[PDB]
C-alpha cells in the first residue's frame, strides 16, 4: 500500500538472520532510496528489500532514524520520503562497575536508623529502564559482627548505607571504632538468570 | 513480520495492566490460535491480541511454554506454530518456614566450642538464587542467660548451632541442666527491609 511511517524493533548483539521489510513499488515508482542514520548497517535493495548487514549496538546508537523514498524510472521521488524508525532493543551485554574499589566513610554514634551517611554507586551501560541496567545492591559481609547482629543496611535500589536499629543502639567508638562492609551489585534487578555482578569494600569509622 | 519464537519476562503477583503482544495476520493468515501452558491465564483474540488476565505465580509455574499459530480462513496453519516463552520473575511473596516448630538436642559438658551439634533448617518457596529465598539464621534469645554471656552460637548461613568459648567453659548439668534457644530465620539475606521471618524453639540438655 502507500509508503508511510513505520517503526521496527530489533535486538542488538545479534548478527542478522531475517530481513526487516520488503517494500513493494506502487507504479509509477520502480525503485527505493534509503537515507539517514544508516551507519553502513541498514541497506535497501533497488526493489525495496530493507535489511541490516551486522549486529546492532544499543550502546552506540539506541534509535536509527532512517527515511525511505520511492522513485520513478527517471529517478524522481513519487512517494515519501517517510521516516522509518529502528528501535534497538537492549540485551544485557554490559557488567555493572562500582565507581570506587574502596570507600572511606564515617558515622556518628546514635545516627538514626535508616538515615543514609554514605552512597556506594555502580554504573551499567545497559538500559536502566530494562532489567539489563537495573542494579541491586547488597551487603555480602560486615566485619566485625557480634552474635549475627547487622549494624548496617543498604537501600538495594539506591546504594544508600545507613545504620540498622541495632547499629544505632550499639555502635560506640570506645568498643569498636571501625567496620568493614563488602558490598555486591548485580544487574537484572537482582534476578538470577543472565546477571553480572561487582563488589567493593567500605571502611566506616564510628565517631562521637 | 513472520511468526518467530519470542520470550517475554513478566513479574508474578501483579494484576495485568498491559497486553503482551499484538500479532498481525499476514495474508493468507486471518486468525491466531494459542496453545500450551495457558493455565486459565493466557488468551489470544482471533485478531492477534495476546494477553494475561490474572496475576502470575512463579511458585505454581516459573515458565509458561506457549505456542502461537496463524490460521487461514479455512483453519489451515499457514505460519508456525512457534514457541512463545513467558519467564515469570520472582517477588518475595513466601515467608521462610522452619521444618520443625520444636527441636530437641543435647550437648556434652566440656564439648569443644564452634563444633556443630544441631542443625535447624528452614525452606523458602521463592527463588533461592535471589534475596527472596536467601536465608539468615539468628539466636533471638537464650534462656537461662548468665551475666549477658551467650553460651550458644549459630552460623547465619547453615543453621549450625555450636557452643561459644564461654559455653564450653561454663556448661555444667549440676548448675543449669537445660537451655532453650529461640531461633529466627529471615529471607532477603536477613535485612529488615522487605523480609519475612519464622521462629523455632530449640531445647538443649547438658549431658555428663
Ligand atoms: Ca551493546
Ligand atoms: Ca548490565
Ligand atoms: Ca545492552
Ligand atoms: Ca508467588
Ligand atoms: Ca521468601
Ligand atoms: Ca515468589
Ligand atoms: Na544486649
XYZ file of N, CA, C and O in Angstrom, chain B residues 28 38 63 65 78 98-99 103 133 146:
40
model
N -1.962 -15.234 3.578
C -3.368 -15.592 3.806
C -3.807 -15.932 5.240
O -4.923 -16.371 5.423
N -1.304 -22.438 29.039
C -2.139 -21.224 29.140
C -2.765 -21.096 30.534
O -2.983 -19.949 30.966
N 7.958 -20.876 34.251
C 7.983 -20.576 32.803
C 6.703 -21.134 32.178
O 6.407 -22.297 32.396
N 5.303 -22.277 28.733
C 5.651 -22.656 27.347
C 4.358 -22.639 26.538
O 3.520 -23.533 26.725
N -0.845 -21.726 8.390
C -0.014 -21.168 7.292
C 1.262 -20.590 7.879
O 2.201 -20.366 7.111
N 10.533 -22.884 59.205
C 11.336 -23.966 59.798
C 10.668 -25.315 59.513
O 9.440 -25.442 59.542
N 11.483 -26.339 59.369
C 10.958 -27.690 59.094
C 10.439 -28.357 60.365
O 9.692 -29.329 60.233
N 12.759 -28.258 68.198
C 13.939 -29.143 68.100
C 14.328 -29.570 69.511
O 14.270 -28.725 70.442
N 14.732 -15.790 48.464
C 14.869 -17.127 49.058
C 16.204 -17.341 49.763
O 16.559 -18.523 50.053
N 23.398 -16.095 81.652
C 24.205 -15.767 82.850
C 25.081 -14.553 82.516
O 25.940 -14.649 81.627
